[PDB]
Design an enzyme around this catalytic site. Structure first.
Site, mmCIF file in Angstrom:
data_model
loop_
_atom_site.group_PDB
_atom_site.id
_atom_site.type_symbol
_atom_site.label_atom_id
_atom_site.label_comp_id
_atom_site.label_asym_id
_atom_site.label_seq_id
_atom_site.Cartn_x
_atom_site.Cartn_y
_atom_site.Cartn_z
ATOM 1 N N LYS A 1 57.482 -55.044 96.695
ATOM 2 C CA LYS A 1 55.706 -54.277 96.560
ATOM 3 C C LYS A 1 55.318 -54.683 98.054
ATOM 4 O O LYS A 1 53.869 -54.252 98.701
ATOM 5 C CB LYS A 1 54.753 -55.487 95.719
ATOM 6 C CG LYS A 1 55.557 -55.324 94.268
ATOM 7 C CD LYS A 1 54.489 -55.515 93.284
ATOM 8 C CE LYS A 1 54.436 -55.089 91.598
ATOM 9 N NZ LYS A 1 55.870 -55.767 91.140
ATOM 10 N N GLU B 1 61.796 -57.992 94.026
ATOM 11 C CA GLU B 1 60.661 -57.191 93.574
ATOM 12 C C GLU B 1 59.446 -56.737 94.318
ATOM 13 O O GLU B 1 59.005 -56.495 94.088
ATOM 14 C CB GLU B 1 60.293 -57.399 92.151
ATOM 15 N N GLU C 1 56.013 -54.056 76.463
ATOM 16 C CA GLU C 1 55.370 -54.177 77.623
ATOM 17 C C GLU C 1 53.597 -53.831 77.348
ATOM 18 O O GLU C 1 52.923 -54.244 77.622
ATOM 19 C CB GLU C 1 56.144 -54.569 79.112
ATOM 20 C CG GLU C 1 55.235 -54.478 80.095
ATOM 21 C CD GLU C 1 56.127 -54.680 81.856
ATOM 22 O OE1 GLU C 1 57.199 -54.291 81.639
ATOM 23 O OE2 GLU C 1 54.942 -54.319 82.614
ATOM 24 N N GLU D 1 44.640 -49.442 89.628
ATOM 25 C CA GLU D 1 43.561 -49.851 88.495
ATOM 26 C C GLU D 1 42.437 -50.152 88.088
ATOM 27 O O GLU D 1 41.828 -50.393 88.628
ATOM 28 C CB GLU D 1 44.814 -51.072 87.490
ATOM 29 C CG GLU D 1 45.068 -51.413 86.299
ATOM 30 C CD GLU D 1 45.722 -52.872 86.535
ATOM 31 O OE1 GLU D 1 45.696 -53.535 85.090
ATOM 32 O OE2 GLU D 1 46.794 -52.250 87.095
ATOM 33 N N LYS E 1 54.598 -65.008 78.877
ATOM 34 C CA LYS E 1 54.761 -63.943 80.812
ATOM 35 C C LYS E 1 53.546 -64.985 81.550
ATOM 36 O O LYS E 1 52.702 -65.363 81.283
ATOM 37 C CB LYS E 1 54.078 -63.357 80.273
ATOM 38 C CG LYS E 1 54.639 -61.699 81.213
ATOM 39 C CD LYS E 1 53.242 -60.823 81.594
ATOM 40 C CE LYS E 1 53.011 -59.730 80.984
ATOM 41 N NZ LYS E 1 52.127 -58.959 81.294
#
Length: 428
Positions: free
Chosen positions: A419, A415, A283, A239, A189
Site C-alpha cells: 500500500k 501488505e 468480509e 471509497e 477485527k
C-alpha cells in the site's frame, strides 16, 4: 482569461450598493468552460492560506476553495451554523473530519469555484456580524491579492531519511498483541496502521503531489487541504463515506480485494474469482451488516444493492452499495453513525478504537477520517484513505491492515509496504 472576466464581474457587484448591516450575501458568477482552466494549479498558485481542492470520484464535480470567512473545528459546529441560513440551502462548507469525527477543520470559503460536468460557477460570499458593506471592502482587497496561474512542477525529490512508526519489531509485537486480544474473545477485527516519515532536503510541493496522485488514480475522489504554506493533507480515495441529497442517503461497503491486471480480461477473470470466493464475500457482508446496524435507528428501510467489483489501478474491490432514507436530513448523524468505518477501525468499533488509541505508536489525525463538503440540501464525504500529511520537507504516509483470528506479522508488514509504495511513487 475566463477567470479574469469573472473576477471583473465580481468587482462590479462589489461596487454597487451594499448596506452597513449584519448579514450574508452570495454572489454567483457564471464561469464559462470553453476550458483551459486547471483549477488545482490556479489554487496552488495563490498565497492566501487556507486552500481546499476536491473532486468527486466520477470526475464530473470539482471545486476549489480559497480563504476562510469562518473556520470550524467540527462538522457538528459547521452544521449548526448552516442551519441559521435556510435561505442559502446550497451554502457549502468544505474540508476534513479527523479520524475522530468529533474533530474537524472545515471552512466557509471566501471564494468557491465549482464545476458540474460542463458548467462552472465562481462564488464569492460576503458575511458579517455587523457590516456587509465593510466586508465587501475586505473582499475587494482579497481579490486584488489573486495571482496568475503558475505551472505546477513535477516532483524530483530524494530521501534524506526514512522512519517507520512501528518498525518491524514494534509491528510484530503489535500484531501478536492484537491476535492474543481477539483470542481472549471480545473483539474480532482491528485495523492497525503504520506511519512512514520521509524527510527531504527541501520543502515538498504538496499540490504537485496532488496532481501526481490525481493523474495516477482514476475513479478516485481527490482531496487536498493546505492549512497554510507549510502544511497539507491530501489523497486519492475510492471509497465513499456518505452522500446525502435532501433525505436520500448513499453509502457503501467496500471490502474484499484482489489484484488488478492491465490485460483487461485477466482483470475480468480475477474479479470473477473475487465475486465467488467465500472469505472475501463474507468480509464484505460483515461490513454491510455493521453499516446497517449503525444506521437502522435513524433510517427507513435499507436497500443493499447487488455486489460489484470496482476496478482500480493496482487493485480491485468488492463493493456493495447501501441506499436509504434518513428520518431527518442531518449530517452529524451520518458522520457519527458511519465514521470510524469497520473497514478502517474494526470489530466492535469501540474495542477496536480503544486498541488503536493505546497501542498505535502515532496519531492518525486526518488519515482515515473524511473529506468533502456539506450544505443543508446535500453533502458528500469520502473516506480519507490513500493519503499523506506534509510538513515542510516531511511527508508522512499511511498504510493499514485488517487483523483477525489468524493474522501473521510478516505477511501483514508485506501488505503494508505494498500500500505505501503506491504513495511513494507520487514522489518521483
Amino acid at each position: 482569461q475566463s477567470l479574469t472576466t469573472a473576477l471583473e464581474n465580481l468587482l462590479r457587484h462589489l461596487s454597487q450598493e451594499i448596506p452597513a448591516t449584519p448579514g450574508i450575501r452570495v454572489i454567483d458568477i457564471p464561469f464559462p468552460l470553453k476550458d483551459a482552466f486547471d483549477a488545482l494549479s490556479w489554487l496552488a498558485s495563490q498565497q492566501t492560506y487556507p486552500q481546499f481542492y476536491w473532486q468527486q470520484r466520477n470526475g464530473d464535480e470539482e471545486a476549489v476553495v480559497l480563504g476562510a470567512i469562518t473556520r470550524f473545528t467540527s462538522l457538528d459546529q459547521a452544521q449548526r451554523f448552516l442551519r441559521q441560513h435556510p435561505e442559502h440551502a446550497d451554502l457549502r462548507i468544505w474540508g476534513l473530519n479527523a479520524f475522530d469525527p468529533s474533530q474537524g477543520n472545515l471552512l466557509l470559503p471566501r471564494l468557491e469555484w465549482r464545476r458540474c460536468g460542463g458548467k462552472a460557477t465562481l462564488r464569492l460570499t460576503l458575511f458579517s456580524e455587523s457590516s456587509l458593506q465593510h466586508d465587501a471592502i475586505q473582499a475587494k482587497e482579497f481579490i486584488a491579492t489573486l495571482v496568475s496561474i503558475k505551472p505546477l512542477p513535477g516532483l524530483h525529490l530524494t530521501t534524506t531519511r526514512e522512519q517507520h512508526w512501528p518498525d518491524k519489531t514494534g509491528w510484530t509485537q503489535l500484531i501478536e498483541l492484537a491476535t492474543k486480544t481477539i483470542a481472549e474473545g471480545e473483539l474480532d477485527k482491528v485495523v492497525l496502521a503504520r506511519a512512514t516519515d520521509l524527510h527531504f532536503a527541501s520543502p515538498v510541493n504538496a499540490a504537485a503531489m496532488m496532481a501526481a496522485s490525481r493523474r495516477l488514480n482514476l475513479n478516485c475522489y481527490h482531496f487536498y487541504m493546505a492549512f497554510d504554506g507549510e502544511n497539507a493533507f491530501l489523497g486519492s480515495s475510492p471509497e465513499r463515506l456518505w452522500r446525502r441529497r435532501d433525505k436520500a442517503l448513499r453509502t457503501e461497503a467496500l471490502a474484499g480485494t484482489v489484484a488488478n491486471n492491465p490485460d483487461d480480461k485477466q482483470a475480468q477473470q480475477l474479479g470473477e474469482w473475487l465475486m465467488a470466493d467465500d472469505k472475501n464475500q463474507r468480509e464484505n457482508m460483515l461490513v454491510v451488516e455493521d453499516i446497517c446496524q449503525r444506521l437502522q435507528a435513524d433510517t427507513q428501510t435499507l436497500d443493499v444493492l447487488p455486489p460489484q467489483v470496482l476496478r482500480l489501478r493496482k487493485v480491485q474491490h468488492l463493493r456493495r452499495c447501501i441506499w436509504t432514507s434518513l428520518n431527518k436530513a442531518d449530517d452529524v448523524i451520518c458522520l457519527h453513525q458511519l465514521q470510524p468505518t469497520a473497514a478502517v477501525a474494526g470489530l466492535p468499533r469501540d474495542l477496536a478504537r480503544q486498541f488503536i488509541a493505546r497501542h498505535e505508536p502515532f496519531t492518525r489525525e486526518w488519515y482515515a477520517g473524511s473529506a468533502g463538503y456539506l450544505s443543508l440540501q446535500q453533502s458528500e464525504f469520502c473516506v480519507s484513505l490513500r493519503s499523506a500529511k506534509i510538513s515542510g520537507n516531511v511527508v508522512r504516509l499511511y498504510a493499514g491492515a485488517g487483523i483477525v483470528r489468524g493474522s501473521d506479522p510478516e505477511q501483514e508488514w508485506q501488505e503494508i509496504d505494498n500500500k505505501a509504495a503506491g504513495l511513494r511513487t507520487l514522489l518521483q
